[PDB]
DNA sequence: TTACCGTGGGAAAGA
DNA sequence: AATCTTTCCCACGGT
């Protein structure tokens, strides 16, 4: 017999309480592929966090019900979607997140893009599922032509997020990535920070508040570097192209993927931005022989840039565990309003098992793909005792549910407009 | 079209 | 020490 | 042929 339906009353228990299980999967958007026999990790190495007040929570229930510490723990492995390439666990022991620093694509894989595939289950082998990165781009190996804007892949857009890492004399034990931690920036062995690349124009000073501009990052451009964790921010810097060991200052094609780049630090004496073991500083040049164009930076002072992407599931156990995976997660990018009210639903991995619910309001749901479904709308009246019309605004949230009472919050919420 | 950065980190020197 | 290994620069092969 | 991308090769300086 099929297992319960969420009721209203465990919703209205859920929209107080909430207590989410998110997972996280922080990744680059592209990967060098591996020749041969060799391996050439993928840089900066993806990370899983286990995100929320949830897991905590269902920690206790688990335990509650007569699990050891053991037992409770979440288990994870990653690996290739859809690969013959083994899995690889990731140790989550102590902490909400693990990176996974051993990963690569053997060309015996044909595929253009690929998914990281992220399967996780308790320590008493009850299932949570498998969950999927973003899509990544194989490359053979970056070209060493200018970056064409037809080539928008390869590109970086302002506003989007990079990691950026050092490494010296090809050693991968020297790798080092740009991250904050307790508020001041470092570089980290094992830890990434994704940051923001705002692009700025040429005359915005200093300050925590600016006028970001869109387009492409080109070298020779002004950027603002902001962690997309703490917010905290770097001076303004000049993104320069890296040749050899020099900067050159008058490069202004677009900058491209796993480029080395140079960060010169705006209004200063050839002061650039600079690692010196896992402390960061400012460095200065020294000016290149009868070249005026290009200047000599330290060692730490040549960064490889990479755009990253985020994959991010949230799910609750509304009835309690259940038999299924709470995979594939649906997630929602948007709602959109449409005789009756019908709000569409637009996103990623919906299932004629779901159900809209309006607050603790279940409306009758139209299952068209995994993309889009639509629902009606409920009548105010089932928000508002009296009214026979919207009197004032009122909001409320909107979520998926399934049969089997997993209910999958989304950030969005609906609001009655008065009619006027 | 305007980003808000918590904090300005001060770059230390060699 | 020897054996082994990612990595980046180049050579070679492919389109 | 010529030029850019893909694949193959290998040595530096790390474990
Ligand atoms: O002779 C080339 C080497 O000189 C050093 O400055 C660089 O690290 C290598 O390219």
Same mark, same amino acid.
Not at chain 1, 204 to 209: P, V
Not at chain 1, 264 to 274: N, P
Not at chain 1, 279 to 286: D, L
Not at chain 1, 413 to 419: A, D, I, L, R
């Given at each position: 017999?099929?297992?319960?339906?969420?009721?209203?009353?465990? *919703?209205?228990?859920?929209?107080?309480?909430?207590?989410d299980?998110?997972?996280?999967?922080?990744?680059?958007?592209?990967?060098?592929?591996?020749?041969?026999?060799? #391996? !050439?990790?993928?840089?900066?190495?993806?990370?899983?966090?286990? *995100?929320? %007040?949830?897991? $905590?929570?269902?920690?206790?229930?688990?335990?509650?019900?007569?699990?050891?510490?053991?037992?409770?723990?979440?288990?994870?492995?990653?690996?290739?979607?859809?690969?013959?390439q083994?899995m690889?666990?990731?140790?989550?022991?102590? $902490?909400?997140?693990?990176?996974?620093?051993?990963?690569?694509?053997? /060309?015996?894989?044909?595929?253009?893009?690929? *998914?990281?595939?992220?399967?996780?289950?308790?320590?008493?082998?009850?299932?949570?599922? +498998?969950?999927?990165?973003? !899509?990544?781009?194989? =490359?053979?190996?970056?070209?060493?032509?200018?970056?064409?804007? #037809?080539?928008?892949?390869?590109?970086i857009?302002?506003?989007? $997020?990079?990691?950026?890492?050092? !490494?010296?004399?090809?050693?991968?034990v020297?790798t080092?990535?740009?991250?904050?931690?307790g508020?001041?920036?470092?570089?980290? %062995?094992?830890?990434?920070?994704?940051?923001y =690349?705002?692009?700025?124009? /040429?005359?915005?000073?200093?300050?925590?508040?600016f006028?970001?501009?869109?387009?492409?990052?080109?070298?020779?451009?002004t950027?603002?570097?902001?962690?997309?964790?703490?917010?905290?921010?770097?001076?303004?810097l000049?993104?320069?192209?890296?040749? $050899?060991?020099?900067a050159?200052?008058?490069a202004? /094609?677009? +900058?491209?993927?796993?480029?080395?780049?140079?960060?010169?630090? #705006?209004?200063?004496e !050839?002061?650039?931005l600079?690692?010196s073991?896992?402390?960061?500083?400012?460095?200065?040049?020294?000016?290149?022989? #009868?070249?005026?164009?290009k200047?000599?930076?330290?060692?730490?002072?040549?960064?490889?840039?990479? %755009?990253?992407?985020?994959?991010?599931?949230?799910?609750?156990?509304?009835?309690?565990?259940?038999?299924?995976p709470?995979?594939? @997660?649906?997630?929602?990018?948007?709602?959109?309003?449409?005789? @009756?009210?019908?709000?569409?639903?637009?996103?990623?991995?919906?299932?004629?098992?779901?159900?809209?619910?309006?607050?603790?309001?279940?409306?009758?749901?139209?299952?068209?793909?995994?993309?889009?479904?639509?629902?009606?709308?409920?009548?105010?009246?089932?928000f508002?005792?009296?009214?026979?019309? +919207?009197?004032?605004?009122?909001?409320?949230?909107?979520?998926?549910?399934?049969?089997?009472?997993?209910?999958?919050?989304? %950030?969005?919420?609906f609001?009655?407009?008065?009619?006027? | 079209?305007?980003?808000?950065?918590?904090?300005?980190?001060?770059?230390?020197?060699?």
């Amino acid at each position: 017999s099929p297992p319960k339906r969420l009721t209203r009353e465990a *919703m209205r228990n859920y929209l107080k309480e909430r207590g989410d299980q998110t997972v996280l999967i922080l990744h680059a958007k592209v990967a060098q592929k591996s020749y041969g026999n060799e #391996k !050439r990790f993928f840089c900066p190495p993806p990370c899983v966090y286990l *995100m929320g %007040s949830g897991w $905590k929570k269902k920690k206790e229930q688990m335990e509650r019900d007569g699990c050891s510490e053991q037992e409770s723990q979440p288990c994870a492995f990653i690996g290739i979607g859809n690969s013959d390439q083994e899995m690889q666990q990731l140790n989550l022991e102590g $902490k909400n997140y693990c990176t996974a620093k051993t990963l690569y694509i053997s /060309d015996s894989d044909k595929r253009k893009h690929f *998914m990281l595939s992220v399967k996780m289950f308790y320590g008493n082998s009850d299932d949570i599922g +498998v969950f999927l990165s973003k !899509r990544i781009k194989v =490359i053979s190996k970056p070209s060493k032509k200018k970056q064409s804007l #037809k080539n928008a892949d390869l590109c970086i857009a302002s506003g989007t $997020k990079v990691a950026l890492f050092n !490494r010296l004399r090809s050693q991968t034990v020297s790798t080092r990535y740009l991250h904050v931690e307790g508020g001041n920036f470092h570089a980290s %062995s094992q830890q990434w920070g994704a940051f923001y =690349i705002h692009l700025l124009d /040429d005359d915005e000073s200093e300050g925590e508040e600016f006028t970001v501009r869109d387009g492409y990052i080109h070298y020779g451009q002004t950027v603002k570097l902001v962690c997309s964790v703490t917010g905290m921010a770097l001076p303004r810097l000049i993104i320069r192209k890296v040749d $050899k060991q020099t900067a050159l200052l008058d490069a202004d /094609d677009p +900058v491209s993927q796993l480029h080395k780049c140079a960060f010169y630090l #705006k209004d200063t004496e !050839r002061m650039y931005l600079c690692l010196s073991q896992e402390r960061i500083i400012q460095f200065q040049a020294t000016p290149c022989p #009868k070249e005026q164009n290009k200047e000599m930076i330290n060692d730490g002072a040549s960064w490889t840039i990479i %755009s990253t992407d985020k994959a991010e599931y949230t799910f609750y156990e509304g009835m309690g565990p259940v038999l299924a995976p709470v995979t594939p @997660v649906p997630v929602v990018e948007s709602l959109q309003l449409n005789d @009756v009210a019908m709000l569409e639903l637009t996103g990623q991995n919906f299932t004629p098992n779901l159900r809209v619910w309006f607050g603790d309001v279940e409306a009758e749901t139209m299952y068209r793909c995994g993309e889009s479904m639509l629902c009606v709308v409920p009548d105010i009246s089932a928000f508002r005792e009296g009214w026979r019309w +919207v009197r004032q605004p009122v909001q409320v949230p909107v979520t998926l549910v399934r049969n089997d009472g997993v209910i999958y919050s989304t %950030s969005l919420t609906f609001t009655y407009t008065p009619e006027p | 079209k305007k980003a808000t950065a918590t904090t300005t980190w001060m770059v230390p020197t060699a």
